[PDB]
Amino acid sequence: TPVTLANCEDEPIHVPGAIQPHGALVTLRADGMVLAASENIQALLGFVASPGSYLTQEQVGPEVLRMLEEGLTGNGPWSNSVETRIGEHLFDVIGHSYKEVFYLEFEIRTADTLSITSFTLNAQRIIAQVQLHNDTASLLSNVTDELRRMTGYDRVMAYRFRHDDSGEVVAESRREDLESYLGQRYPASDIPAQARRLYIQNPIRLIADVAYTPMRVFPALNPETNESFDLSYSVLRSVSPIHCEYLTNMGVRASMSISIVVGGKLWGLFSCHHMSPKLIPYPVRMSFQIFSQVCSAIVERLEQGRIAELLRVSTERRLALARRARDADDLFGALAHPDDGIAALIPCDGALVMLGGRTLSIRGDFERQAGNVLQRLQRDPERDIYHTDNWDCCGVLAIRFHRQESGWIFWFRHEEVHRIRWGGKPEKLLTIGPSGPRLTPRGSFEAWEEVVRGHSTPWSETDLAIAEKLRLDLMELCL
């Protein structure tokens, strides 16, 4: 059924019946028999791959056939890209085997191929820069700027995805002309499950011309299975109408994205946008897929090194709490210490200490809410750690360290705030599509707002780790 805003969350974009027109596609079954092909084989390649047929050396050349032959029956690895000029143009021919189907893709090459030396040199510079700077925010920033020098794209941004899958533009190099989307936030809904899986499975993804018209592949179904063809790993797999509308609203008509994958999760991706159709040669894209690997590798460690630091200041800051509580025998004093205090342990907008009936509220008037939270927990006598990002103050983390005299510690966070807003000279809409204003950056951001309304920043894994240890410390102190 036709994709609407109402059902786009479930659009199966891995089994579209089409490909992008700047290439051709022939899908083969495990024994070499053609199962399907795209409308334009004869026009682009000058021959008709008929279902039931087997390709000949005559049709598609020795280079392609030899790859096709070692590629089909595929124990062990094999070169899966080949050059050949079947016609008058130049074709990179790319083959891969997913499920049990073999996809043979013909993509026209335009620009000079990858200069492997001048790519190695560029790889040095980037690794050398992040050698100096162990900010993962600096890596993103540098590689972003660098991607634009290399590719020549009009804009390249770096997205970081939070735990709730929402996105944030944490870097950007555009040409002076264009408006900046720096600091943009967008909801999980802007990158649906299927699209997200595809960003994890595929490092690089390219959209040559957004204002194109899809070239269908027939037959639509796989006669061997009576189900659609899975084009997850296809270089030419067509784009969604929804997205294409979104992109044209922005005035963008060529996209090129490099994934950053850590764990199973998609940690973020570099998005390259062009204002006119743009095509990047397969082997070049393959060099960028290397960046995808390197960044993912580096970013992973930079991140685990950061939580490592958080954990170090935590323990050191707990050590001070012991150096301090055991001397004068007053928790409150130690806990309320400005720099090393609990309000500084876990990032928050305020804290509250309870022991006996004594209440020390730090950075605001938190007794009332701490009182109300406690009344709730009264109906839940066995809970020792409470935390919610719903509820003055909607984020709450409570740990009980002494039950008899009801000793608790509370951290509070206010609603989540958009870090950086742009203002002044406002809003050149460019055309709006039929689907509505939802498919514009402003529409997306407003969609994010509605999502986070009433929610604080989520209690990190580490924030919870530190609090659980702090609770253990407080328990033994009271003993």
| Binding residue numbers for a tetrapyrrole | 8
Residue 147 CB neighbour total at 10 angstroms: 25
**Which x/- pattern over 64-103 shows residues binding its own copies (rule: CB under 8 A)?**
-------------xxxxx------------x---------
- The residue (of 189 and 296) whose beta carbon lies closer to ligand BLA is 189
The one of its own copies, ligand BLA, none whose footprint includes residue 271, by CB under 5 to 8 A per kind, is ligand BLA
Write down the least CB distance from residue 129 to its own copies, Å. Answer: 10
Query: What is the phi/psi pair of residue 313, to 5°?
Result: -60, -30
Query: Applying CB under 6 A, which of residues 184, 232, 287, 369 lies at the interface with ligand BLA?
Result: 184
Check residue 228 for interaction with its own copies (CB under 8 A). no
Check residue 5 for interaction with ligand BLA (CB under 6 A). yes
- State how beta strands 407-413 and 23-28 pair: unpaired
Check residue 439 for interaction with ligand BLA (CB under 6 A). yes
Tell me how far apart the alpha carbons of residues 300 and 294 are, in angstroms, rounded to a whole number.
Answer: 10
- The residue (of 67 and 231) whose beta carbon lies closer to its own copies is 67
Write down the least CB distance from residue 465 to its own copies, Å. Answer: 12
* Options 2-10, 62-70, 210-218, 465-473: segment touching ligand BLA (CB under 6 A): 2-10
**Closest residue by Cα to residue 130 from 118, 141, 115, 145:** 141
Tokens 């990858």 appear where? 114
Q: Tell me the C-alpha to C-alpha distance, in Å, between residue 52 and each of 15, 35, 99, 305, 337.
A: 22, 7, 19, 56, 79
* Options 52-60, 71-79, 187-195, 220-228: segment touching ligand BLA (CB under 6 A): 187-195
Torsion of the alpha carbons at 155, 160, 161 and 166, rounded to the nearest 10: -60
Contact 135, 305 (CB under 8 A): no
Check residue 300 for interaction with its own copies (CB under 8 A). yes
Contact 460, 306 (CB under 8 A): no
Cis peptide, bond prior to residue 347, ω within 30 of zero: no
- State how beta strands 101-108 and 91-98 pair: antiparallel
Query: Applying CB under 6 A, which of residues 160, 205, 317, 400 lies at the interface with ligand BLA?
Result: 205
**Closest residue by Cα to residue 168 from 362, 361, 417:** 417
The residues binding its own copies (CB under 8 A) are 77-81, 94, 114-121, 123-125, 127-128, 130-131, 134, 283, 286-287, 289-290, 293-294, 296-298, 300-302, 304-305, 308-309, 311-312, 315-316, 318-319, 322-323, 326-327, 476
The residues binding ligand BLA (CB under 6 A) are 5, 8-9, 13, 181, 184, 186, 189-192, 195, 205, 207, 239-240, 242-243, 246, 255, 257, 271, 439, 441, 444
